[PDB]
Design a protein that fits this description.
2 copies of one chain form a homodimer.
Chain A (H helix, E strand, L loop, with lengths): L4 E5 L3 H8 L3 H5 L2 H14 L4 E8 L7 H10 L3 H5 L5 E5 L7 H14 L6 E8 L1 H17 L10 H7 L9 E4 L18 E4 L9 H17 L1
Parallel strand pairs in A: 1-2, 1-5, 2-4, 3-4, 5-6
The complex binds dimethylallyl S-thiolodiphosphate.
C-alpha cells in the first residue's frame, strides 16, 4: 500500500533559519539537498512520482533580496540532479524566470529525460489558478479553430491540457504547520489525502516521511 | 479566545460520517442520513449568532451516484425535506450543482426553497447538490468557450477574475473548511475556491458535531490567520 505520487509543499525554510539565528539564505540552501534526500528515500520505497512546490506565482511579492537569492539559487538544480538518476521536470511559468535559470532548467530536463526511476516534478513559478487558466485558454483556442466542440470539454480533456499530469497525487505532505494548499495543484488534489506536520522542511527526515506514509495507509484502509 | 471581531465570513462544510454513525448505533444507514439537514440547520443557527455570513455545505457529490441505488433514491427523496427545514428559518438558501439531473420534484422543491427564502437578510446557506469541483470548472469553461465563439470575449480576457465570475461557488471564497468523519481529503468539493482556505479535519461524525466542535475549528482558524 505505497503511494505512487506524493505531492510536497516544502514550507518552513525561512522560519527554520530565523528560529536558529541564521541568515534566511541558510534555510533556502537546504531546499534542494533535502528534496534530493527525499527522492532517494522515496525511490527505495517504490514511490514513482514526487511533485514539489518550490516557488509560487505569489512569491514574487517577497523581499527582492530573498527573491534574487532564490532565483540565483535555483540555478543549482543541474548540479544537484543532473547525475542523480531522477527524471526531472519543471512546471510553472518559465518565461518570467531569468534567462540563465530558464537555460539551466531546460538543461536539467534534457539531461535527465532518459532516466527510468523516480519522476521529480518541481513547481517553480507555479499556481493552480494559472495551470487551470492556461489549460482553459488552450481549450478555447482549439474551439476557436474548429478543432473541438463544446461537447468534447470534459475531465479527460483538462487532464491532457494541465501541466501536472495524471496520475494525480495520492498523498500531499505539507511541512511548516499551516493547513492550506496555497494555490498548489488545485484540480489535481481532488481526491488526494492530506498530511500536515509542524516539522519544518529542513528538519523533515526519513522517520517523518514514514509517519506520513503510515498515516496514509491507515486512512486508505478506513477510506 | 474566540475573537468576535475575526469570524470567518465563509465556512465550507463536508458533512461526512452519517453512515458510520448509524452502524455504530446498530441502526440502518437511513437513520444516519436523516440527521443531515437537522444538524445543518443547527450549524446555521449557531453560525448566524457568531456573525458568519456564508456556509457552503456538501450535500451530494457528482460521484455519489455510484452508490447503492437504495441509498441514492432515499437521499433524493430526503432532500425534499430542505423546504420544511429552511423555508421559515431566516436563512437564505441557494443550491449549486447540476440541477437538471435531479428528479423533477426535487427541482421544483429547490426552486421553491430558493424563492421563499431569497428575501432573507441573514446567513446565506449554499447547498452543494449534485456538485463537484471538476463540474464547476468544466461548466465555467464551457460558458467561456460559448462566449468566445460568439465574439463576446477574447482569449486574452481569460483570467482569474473572469473565472471567479463564471464559477457557481462565488467570492468571497471559504476562509475555513471543516470536514467531519475523519477522512482528510476534499473529495472533489470546491477545488478552485479552496486555494487559500484553512483546512480543519475532525474524527467527530457529523450527527455528533456541535457548537463546541465548531468554536474549536474557528479558534484554530483564528490562530493561523496571516496576510
Ligand atoms: C511555495 C511554498 C512551498 C508555500 C507557499 S508559502 P504561503 O502559504 O504564504 O502562500 P504564498 O505562496 O506566499 O502566497
Amino acid at each position: 500500500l505505497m503511494p505512487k505520487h506524493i505531492a510536497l509543499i516544502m514550507d518552513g525554510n525561512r522560519r527554520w533559519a530565523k528560529d536558529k539565528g541564521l541568515d534566511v539564505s541558510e534555510g533556502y540552501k537546504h531546499l534542494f539537498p533535502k528534496l534530493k534526500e527525499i527522492c532517494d528515500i522515496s525511490s527505495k520505497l517504490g514511490i514513482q512520482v514526487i511533485t514539489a512546490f518550490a516557488f509560487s506565482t505569489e512569491n514574487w511579492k517577497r523581499a527582492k533580496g530573498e527573491v534574487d537569492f532564490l532565483m540565483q539559487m535555483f540555478e543549482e538544480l543541474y548540479d544537484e540532479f543532473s547525475r542523480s538518476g531522477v527524471r526531472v521536470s519543471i512546471i510553472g511559468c518559465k518565461t518570467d524566470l531569468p534567462m540563465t535559470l530558464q537555460k539551466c532548467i531546460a538543461l536539467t530536463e534534457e539531461t535527465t529525460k532518459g532516466n527510468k526511476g523516480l519522476h521529480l516534478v518541481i513547481a517553480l513559478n507555479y499556481g493552480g489558478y494559472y495551470d487551470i487558466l492556461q489549460a482553459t485558454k488552450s481549450i478555447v483556442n482549439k474551439a476557436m479553430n474548429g478543432l473541438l466542440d463544446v461537447e468534447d470539454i470534459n475531465k479527460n480533456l483538462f487532464d491532457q491540457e494541465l501541466e501536472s499530469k495524471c496520475p494525480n497525487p495520492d498523498l500531499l505532505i505539507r511541512t511548516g504547520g499551516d493547513q492550506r494548499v496555497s494555490n498548489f495543484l488545485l484540480w489535481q488534489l481532488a481526491y488526494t489525502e492530506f498530511y500536515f506536520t509542524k516539522t519544518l522542511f529542513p528538519d523533515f527526515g526519513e522517520e517523518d516521511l514514514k509517519e506520513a506514509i503510515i498515516n496514509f495507509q491507515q486512512r486508505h484502509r478506513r477510506f
